Amino acid sequence: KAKSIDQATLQLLDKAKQDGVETVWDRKADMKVQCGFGSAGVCCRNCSMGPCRVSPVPGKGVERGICGATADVIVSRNFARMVAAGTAAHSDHGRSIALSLYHTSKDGDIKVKDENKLKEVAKSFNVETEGRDIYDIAHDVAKEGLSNYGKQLGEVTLPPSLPEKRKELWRKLGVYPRAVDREIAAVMHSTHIGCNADAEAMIKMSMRCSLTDGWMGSFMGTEFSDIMFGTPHSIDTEANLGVLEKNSVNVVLHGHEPLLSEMVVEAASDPELVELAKSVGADGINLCGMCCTGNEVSMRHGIKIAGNFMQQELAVVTGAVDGLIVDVQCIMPALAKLSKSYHTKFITTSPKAHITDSIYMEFDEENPLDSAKKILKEAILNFKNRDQSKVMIPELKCKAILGYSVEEIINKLDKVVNTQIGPMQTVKPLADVLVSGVLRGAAAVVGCNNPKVVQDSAHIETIKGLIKNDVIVVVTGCAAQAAAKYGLLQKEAAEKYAGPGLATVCKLVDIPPVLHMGSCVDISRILDLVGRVANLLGVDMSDLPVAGVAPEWMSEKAVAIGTYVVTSGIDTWLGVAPPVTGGPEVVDILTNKMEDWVGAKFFIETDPHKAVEQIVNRMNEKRKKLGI
Amino acid sequence: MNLFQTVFTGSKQALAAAEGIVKQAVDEKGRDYKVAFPDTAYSLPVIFAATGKKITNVGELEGALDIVRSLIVEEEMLDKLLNSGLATAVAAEIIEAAKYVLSDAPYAEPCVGFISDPIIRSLGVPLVTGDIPGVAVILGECPDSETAAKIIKDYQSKGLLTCLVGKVIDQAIEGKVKMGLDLRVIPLGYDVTSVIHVVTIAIRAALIFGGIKGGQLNDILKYTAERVPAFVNAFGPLSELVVSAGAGAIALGFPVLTDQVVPEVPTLLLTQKDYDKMVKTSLEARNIKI
Numbered sequence: 001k002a003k004s005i006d007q008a009t010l011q012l013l014d015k016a017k018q019d020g021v022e023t024v025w026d027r028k029a030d031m032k033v034q035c036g037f038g039s040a041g042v043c044c045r046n047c048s049m050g051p052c053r054v055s056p057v058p059g060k061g062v063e064r065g066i067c068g069a070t071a072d073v074i075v076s077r078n079f080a081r082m083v084a085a086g087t088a089a090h091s092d093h094g095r096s097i098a099l100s101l102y103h104t105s106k107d108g109d110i111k112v113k114d115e116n117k118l119k120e121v122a123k124s125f126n127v128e129t130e131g132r133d134i135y136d137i138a139h140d141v142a143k144e145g146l147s148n149y150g151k152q153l154g155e156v157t158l159p160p161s162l163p164e165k166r167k168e169l170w171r172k173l174g175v176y177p178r179a180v181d182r183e184i185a186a187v188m189h190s191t192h193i194g195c196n197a198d199a200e201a202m203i204k205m206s207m208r209c210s211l212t213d214g215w216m217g218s219f220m221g222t223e224f225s226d227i228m229f230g231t232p233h234s235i236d237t238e239a240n241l242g243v244l245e246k247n248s249v250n251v252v253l254h255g256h257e258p259l260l261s262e263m264v265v266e267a268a269s270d271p272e273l274v275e276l277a278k279s280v281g282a283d284g285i286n287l288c289g290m291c292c293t294g295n296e297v298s299m300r301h302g303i304k305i306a307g308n309f310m311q312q313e314l315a316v317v318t319g320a321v322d323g324l325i326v327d328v329q330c331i332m333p334a335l336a337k338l339s340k341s342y343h344t345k346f347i348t349t350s351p352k353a354h355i356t357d358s359i360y361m362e363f364d365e366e367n368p369l370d371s372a373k374k375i376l377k378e379a380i381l382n383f384k385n386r387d388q389s390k391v392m393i394p395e396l397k398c399k400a401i402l403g404y405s406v407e408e409i410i411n412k413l414d415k416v417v418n419t420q421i422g423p424m425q426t427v428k429p430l431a432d433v434l435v436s437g438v439l440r441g442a443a444a445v446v447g448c449n450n451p452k453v454v455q456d457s458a459h460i461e462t463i464k465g466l467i468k469n470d471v472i473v474v475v476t477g478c479a480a481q482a483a484a485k486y487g488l489l490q491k492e493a494a495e496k497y498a499g500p501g502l503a504t505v506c507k508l509v510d511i512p513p514v515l516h517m518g519s520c521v522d523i524s525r526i527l528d529l530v531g532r533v534a535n536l537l538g539v540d541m542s543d544l545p546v547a548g549v550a551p552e553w554m555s556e557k558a559v560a561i562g563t564y565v566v567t568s569g570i571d572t573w574l575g576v577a578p579p580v581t582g583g584p585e586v587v588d589i590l591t592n593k594m595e596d597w598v599g600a601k602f603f604i605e606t607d608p609h610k611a612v613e614q615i616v617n618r619m620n621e622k623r624k625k626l627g628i
Numbered sequence: 629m630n631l632f633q634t635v636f637t638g639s640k641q642a643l644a645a646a647e648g649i650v651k652q653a654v655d656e657k658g659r660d661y662k663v664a665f666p667d668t669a670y671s672l673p674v675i676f677a678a679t680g681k682k683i684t685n686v687g688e689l690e691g692a693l694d695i696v697r698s699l700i701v702e703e704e705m706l707d708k709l710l711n712s713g714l715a716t717a718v719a720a721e722i723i724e725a726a727k728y729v730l731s732d733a734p735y736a737e738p739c740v741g742f743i744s745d746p747i748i749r750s751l752g753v754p755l756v757t758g759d760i761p762g763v764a765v766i767l768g769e770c771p772d773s774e775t776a777a778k779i780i781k782d783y784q785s786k787g788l789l790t791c792l793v794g795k796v797i798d799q800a801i802e803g804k805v806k807m808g809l810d811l812r813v814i815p816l817g818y819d820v821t822s823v824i825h826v827v828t829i830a831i832r833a834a835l836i837f838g839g840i841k842g843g844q845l846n847d848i849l850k851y852t853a854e855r856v857p858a859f860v861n862a863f864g865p866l867s868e869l870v871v872s873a874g875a876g877a878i879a880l881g882f883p884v885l886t887d888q889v890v891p892e893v894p895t896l897l898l899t900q901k902d903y904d905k906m907v908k909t910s911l912e913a914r915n916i917k918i
């Protein structure tokens with residue numbers, strides 16, 4: 001099987017083979033046939049009476065664990081713990097953002113750059129704004145956001161875009177969210193030996209936990225990031241490994257937390273550091289981003305995107321990365337080993353993510369700019385250790401357009417609003433094109449890479465099929481970066497891949513057929529968008545012809561995302577089977593009974609063409625239900 | 629019934645009416661009997677633009693229903709909707725041709741029916757010059773004669789060439805609107821199919837001024853969209869046939885504005901209840917400068 005559809009990826013894999021270094025593909029091959037029990041989710045290790053493995057085939061072999069737990073119980077608890085872990089990752093990201101908001105000041109390193117956005121958020125949090133200092137407002141907003149994480153009395157605060165009907169449905173179902181850390185703790189408590197042994201209740205607890213990710217953690221992280229670093233607008237950038245410069249210092253930012261990457265971008269324009277880069281013999285400083293931190297700095301500043309998850313190692317294989325600065329999440333620990341074969345400084349900066357044999361330079365949130373300058377100076381000084389004979393940068397990079405926040409999308413939609421009719425600054429043109437049938441629907445393509453799928457193949461095939469069927473596509477994360485590398489994030493792509501209705505819409509609004517809405521936490525924006533459409537049409541989000549796809553997901557964060565997208569009322573297709581096939585009841589809940597609960601359900605489909613067909617059929621049947 | 633289904637239903641009704649009237653023409657006059665429009669050089673302009681074929685006898689008119697049949701594909705995608713609008717336009721043209729071959733004088737005053745080529749050439753000079761900054765296709769009935777007269781005279785005072793289809797003709801007559809080719813208020817006919825008589829104005833504008841040869845349908849549609857500043861104001865309740873004819877106008881690149889609740893399409897299908905702002909809304913939608 002081919003390892004990737006990306007030519008630059010293939011060239012660097014040949015180079016890695018020539019250099020005698022191992023990749024994620026090599027380790028996947030070394031793992032050989034993976035354990036069937038773990039793959040089906042019928043293995044349990046929740047107590048030291050175990051490990052227990054029960055048969056993935058009902059009626060044969062061992063039926064219960066030592067405590068008496070069935071295959072359905074073991075599967076449901078394993079799934080719930082994946083959701084809890086994903087929720088924890090996203091919530092910790094949002095908590096750091098809220099704490100940064102709490103420390104903003106007029107003369108400090110972290111300021112308020114979008115005051116209108118802050119005032120709207122303050123309105124959503126019942127924070128007074130009129131005749132008040134902007135930083136007093138910011139601190140009050142940060143306090144309310146922080147209380148969302150750990151309040152023990154009262155109800156949490158949810159964005160106004162969430163329909164009232166969806167909230168009432170959640171309350172009736174028993175999944176209405178509480179404080180984020182409280183829900184994570186509840187899931188961890190109920191999976192403990194001898195607690196919850198009922199699959200339906202376990203799945204409902206996991207949905208409840210995932211809601212605190214989708215609508216509170218990721219949402220607050222995104223909106224506070226907009227407040228502090230600016231709301232994204234349409235902006236040009238370049239993507240894929242070709243963005244590395246042979247003659248410049250190459251600094252690659254990998255990870256998820258945006259404050260460090262924002263401070264590194266600011267430090268790169270420091271005159272002393274630019275002079276130092278010149279003095280070490282480089283033309284300048286070339287900042288490149290990877291994964292979600294790359295998505296953030298690219299959405300807000302046009303920083304070039306070096307690559308997505310399964311390309312991180314190959315970035316080092318070029319031999320041109322002088323510094324690789326990582327914060328947390330989706331940072332392959334093998335990088336520490338791999339950087340030994342090159343001059344690269346692999347720099348960890350977060351106390352949450354220590355990696356053995358990496359260079360640890362703790363990013364100081366109290367003095368973010370000075371700390372970022374010190375880290376960047378280490379990366380720049382490493383340019384003297386470059387071995388130019390080992391350098392091979394593929395001449396493969398692609399132009400991309402991104403920055404499509406909900407605000408930017410609304411601004412673009414204002415173009416097709418007749419001034420004599422109005423209203424302006426709404427999602428009404430999008431609702432109109434969806435209701436009329438010019439657009440069949442909207443689909444979100446999100447998720448990681450996975451060695452089980454030819455890298456980027458499923459993302460590209462799913463996106464092309466959807467836009468060919470007049471389904472407008474919004475992309476986040478590594479899927480968005482796969483689209484960027486391929487060339488879908490271009491206005492020209494409208495006439496090259498889209499169907500007639502979507503091509504007309506793209507021409508009228510002057511947008512690409514695929515809209516890059518940011519990082520994984522920026523999936524909250526998608527929720528926001530859908531909610532607005534629903535609120536404009538007076539229906540629940542489960543009545544709309546919308547869907548989400550995770551063609552190549554790998555992370556626990558992806559599991560939590562799919563769970564809260566389904567719980568919000570949006571059908572979700574998974575291109576990688578989750579470890580639930582061992583529990584028939586869990587499969588039936590996720591793919592059949594969920595529709596009775598929340599009006600949406602999971603679809604497991606490993607063939608992208610079949611997934612596109614199923615998405616189109618499901619959207620059409622929801623349209624016929626809605627009468628459009 | 630959604631927009632696509634409404635357009636498909638309208639196109640099927642137009643096809644049924646065309647089949648009935650063609651059967652009547654075949655029964656009364658014979659398949660060798662001549663089929664023509666008064667003083668034109670492009671036979672039936674819509675069929676000539678779509679295929680390049682000139683319809684000369686009744687048998688060929690009966691064979692032209694296959695064009696309407698092949699232009700109706702009931703799949704909910706935008707291209708099929710535009711093709712279905714074009715099918716309605718072809719069916720309306722066939723109905724008008726059958727009217728002309730059945731009756732010696734199908735239209736009486738003030739209705740003018742078909743517009744001859746010399747009138748098109750006369751209007752071409754003020755069209756490109758800018759003395760005619762647009763073509764207002766008014767179809768249906770306004771709630772009052774006063775509002776219809778007000779809108780029509782507002783268009784007239786701005787130099788636009790306004791064409792009238794339906795009961796709006798009677799409302800304008802009650803409103804003391806002075807009509808004629810020099811007064812730029814042209815009543816086409818009381819039936820919806822009479823709207824084709826302004827559509828052929830645009831089509832022949834591509835045939836005469838644009839120089840596009842017959843059968844180059846995409847070139848004709850591009851020319852009408854980028855050169856002919858026409859728009860539709862549909863007043864009063866809209867049947868499926870009216871919506872299908874509006875889909876044809878959209879296929880020609882002409883935006884359709886109405887006072888009725890319809891599934892809106894930005895820049896193409898717009899609802900404007902306020903009759904005091906309909907003229908400005910149409911001028912903005914068609915990008916017309918006075």
Ligand code: SF4
Pocket residue numbers: 044045046047048049050051052064065066067068069074192193194
């Ligand atoms: S919780 Fe039950 S099934 Fe799991 S390891 Fe312990 S005894 Fe075995």
